[PDB]
RNA sequence: ACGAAUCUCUUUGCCUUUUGGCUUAGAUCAAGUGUAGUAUCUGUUCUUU
RNA sequence: GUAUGUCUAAAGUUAUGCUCUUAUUUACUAACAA
């Protein structure tokens, strides 16, 4: 509907704050996080970041006062919101396809690697440069991870199509997913009871999953219709972005309904501070807002 | 009925779909280059895509015309039935 | 509960033996056998022989046939098998008509969902794990396109890894010409065609790379 | 009405995803549990359509 | 428990009707325990 040039170059990660959130978190292809406000007059304070590579999976601790960031070369950074100096992680084994703090508590730290393990990073932890645990029971590149919402458990999907339900430290899979099926973006509907962990697949539709057990994982109705190489979040319903053309609304009930024109790419979210307004991420500064 | 018959009567066909509506010798090089009209191969390219096309379509609904188990088997039955 | 076989010819059971008949034909009785939970392969056999075979016939015998019937009776006595075949009757059928003359639910179906299950399920294990291989292999080559797409969005240009080959004369088609077995030698001239396709080649490749 | 073209159906023709070896039918048909997973069951309630 | 088969092992190639909650079965599987 209304839009805002940000990025130039390609790729972005467009989220927005926690639950009470105002605030809209880029982070293009362009090597540069950047913040802009839900009110239209769009307010830019650039959180510039050392390392070269462009940066790739951005999102917020539960406190909203430092936000995670992943790129290629080997380095993730925490970014505190408005300040921008914080603590630093310039040395990996390769990049970290998708990293995401705890629900909880912002200072367990989740980060998922290209090489298949995965790292956990406290506050105090940070200080020493260790873990508390690693996982090492996905075999591929993970890209997808993502807690179940209480702060204990969580789930972690993978290039080789299985989804990983562990509790927060245990390092212990609770349930393995799967096989036929495929998996790319791992995100928990805003579900009234909060059973629910739905997840984006490769081949053009979008699961859904009990995720209270963590053991129940028996799909209701599938979403779909969404051509898909790009990503999905919900709130009744849920919208999802696809591959070639454009953007799909969804009744999370019935799985159907509008389909609104995205100019390509697809990154979409909801601010969830209101009912009704979304973010789309097109390549190359085309962020669309409803 | 042979390929012999099956030929000349598909033959008479396509002459009935025609029905509807030089020589220049290097030899030296042996190159017999018959410079022809290129609206005509293009009318013959776009027709005989087309015949193909009608038959490539005439098997597509006698495909979609409904004792087995599979797709393989149902066919299989049916070449016996025929018998 | 483990037990020794038995019992009586439930009419969806006689289906269930009919329907694997079909499938497996009259000499691989085990295999039937096992398709019924309650019922033996000899019990199987002897009833498809006895009473289910459709080359069978139980319609009443004419008085002619009765004559026959009896005569062989006096003459062959009580050896009903070669009488049967006689008469061209299943044995047991015979006799009773020779005499005449004289004077749960549940378990059903899971063997059925099982049943129906096994018969539409016809390919030895070997097949079902290469399909499986097949999919999984497919998911992960989407996978990876993902990946290599991604980096190209991000701006990184990665070729897409050879299969890692199997042998020093492996091949790779897209490298050169699979083995170029040349056309005919021409009689006519084909330069100008030759040109044509060649832009149409080169156009297309543009397209793709549009695309 | 004859000639032609386009479309649909029916009859036949074409088998058009239409069984790809051999052996002693190649051989032999069971006595299991709990723990877990997976699927499948069935019920079970309520929600709104 | 194996044959066997994949996987990893780091350096950037110069383009712009449904949801739900559960309890029960059955099957299969299981170098996991009995």
């Known amino acids: 509907i209304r839009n805002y040039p940000g990025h130039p170059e390609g790729t972005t990660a467009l989220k927005f704050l926690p639950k009470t959130g105002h605030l809209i978190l880029s982070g293009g292809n362009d090597h540069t996080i950047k913040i802009w406000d839900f009110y239209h007059d769009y307010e830019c304070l650039r959180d510039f970041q050392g390392h070269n590579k462009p940066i790739k999976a951005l999102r917020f601790t539960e406190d909203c006062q430092s936000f995670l960031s992943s790129s290629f070369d080997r380095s993730v950074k925490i970014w505190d919101t408005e300040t921008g100096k914080v603590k630093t992680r310039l040395h990996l084994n390769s990049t970290p396809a998708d990293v995401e703090s705890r629900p909880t508590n912002p200072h367990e730290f989740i980060v998922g690697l290209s090489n298949s393990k995965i790292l956990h990073y406290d506050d105090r932890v940070s200080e020493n440069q260790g873990l508390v645990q690693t996982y090492d029971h996905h075999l591929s590149s993970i890209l997808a991870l993502k807690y179940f919402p209480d702060g204990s458990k969580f789930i972690s999907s993978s290039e080789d199509k299985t989804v990983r339900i562990w509790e927060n430290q245990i390092n212990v899979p609770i349930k393995q997913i799967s096989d036929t099926a495929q998996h790319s973006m791992p995100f928990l509907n805003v579900h009234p009871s909060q059973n629910y962990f739905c997840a984006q697949s490769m081949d053009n539709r979008i699961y859904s999953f009990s995720l209270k057990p963590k053991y129940k994982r028996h799909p209701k109705k599938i979403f779909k219709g969404h051509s898909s190489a790009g990503y999905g979040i919900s709130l009744r319903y849920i919208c999802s972005g696809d591959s070639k053309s454009r953007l799909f609304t969804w009744d999370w009930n019935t799985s159907r309904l509008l389909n609104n024109i995205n100019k390509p790419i697809t990154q979409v979210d909801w601010h969830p501070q209101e009912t009704s307004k979304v973010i789309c991420s097109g390549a190359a500064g085309k962020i669309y807002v409803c | 009925i042979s390929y012999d018959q099956l030929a000349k009567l598909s033959y008479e066909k396509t002459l009935r779909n025609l029905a509807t509506q030089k020589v220049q010798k290097d030899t030296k090089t042996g190159k017999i280059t018959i410079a022809d009209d290129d609206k005509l191969v293009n009318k013959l390219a776009v027709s005989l895509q087309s015949e193909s096309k009608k038959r490539y379509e005439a098997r597509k609904r006698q495909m979609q015309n409904a004792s087995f188990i599979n797709d393989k088997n149902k066919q299989f039955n049916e070449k016996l039935s025929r018998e | ?211």
């Not at chain 3, 289906?15 to 009259?26: D, M, N």
């Not at chain 3, 062989?72 to 049967?84: D, V, Y």
């Not at chain 3, 015979?94 to 016809?122: F, G, H, I, Q, S």
């Open chain 3, 1 to 211: 509960p483990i037990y020794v076989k038995g019992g009586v010819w439930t009419n969806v059971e006689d289906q269930i033996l009919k329907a694997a008949v079909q499938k497996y034909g009259t000499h691989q009785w085990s295999k039937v056998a096992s398709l019924l939970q309650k019922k033996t392969a000899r019990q199987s056999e002897l009833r498809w022989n006895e009473y289910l075979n459709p080359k069978l016939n139980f319609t009443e015998f004419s008085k002619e046939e009765d004559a026959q019937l009896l005569d062989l009776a006096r003459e062959l006595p009580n050896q009903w098998r070669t009488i049967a075949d006689m008469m061209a009757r299943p044995a047991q059928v015979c006799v009773e008509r020779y005499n005449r003359l004289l004077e749960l639910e549940d378990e059903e179906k899971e063997m059925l969902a099982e049943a129906r299950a096994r018969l539409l399920n016809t390919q030895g294990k070997k097949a079902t794990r290469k399909i499986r291989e097949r999919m999984l292999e497919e998911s992960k080559r989407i996978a990876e396109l993902q990946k290599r797409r991604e980096l190209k969005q991000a701006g990184i240009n990665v070729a897409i890894k050879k299969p890692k080959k199997k042998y020093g004369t492996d091949i790779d088609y897209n490298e050169d010409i699979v083995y170029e077995q040349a056309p005919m030698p021409g009689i006519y001239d084909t330069s100008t065609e030759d040109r044509q396709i060649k832009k149409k080649f080169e156009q297309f490749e543009r397209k793709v790379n549009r695309k």
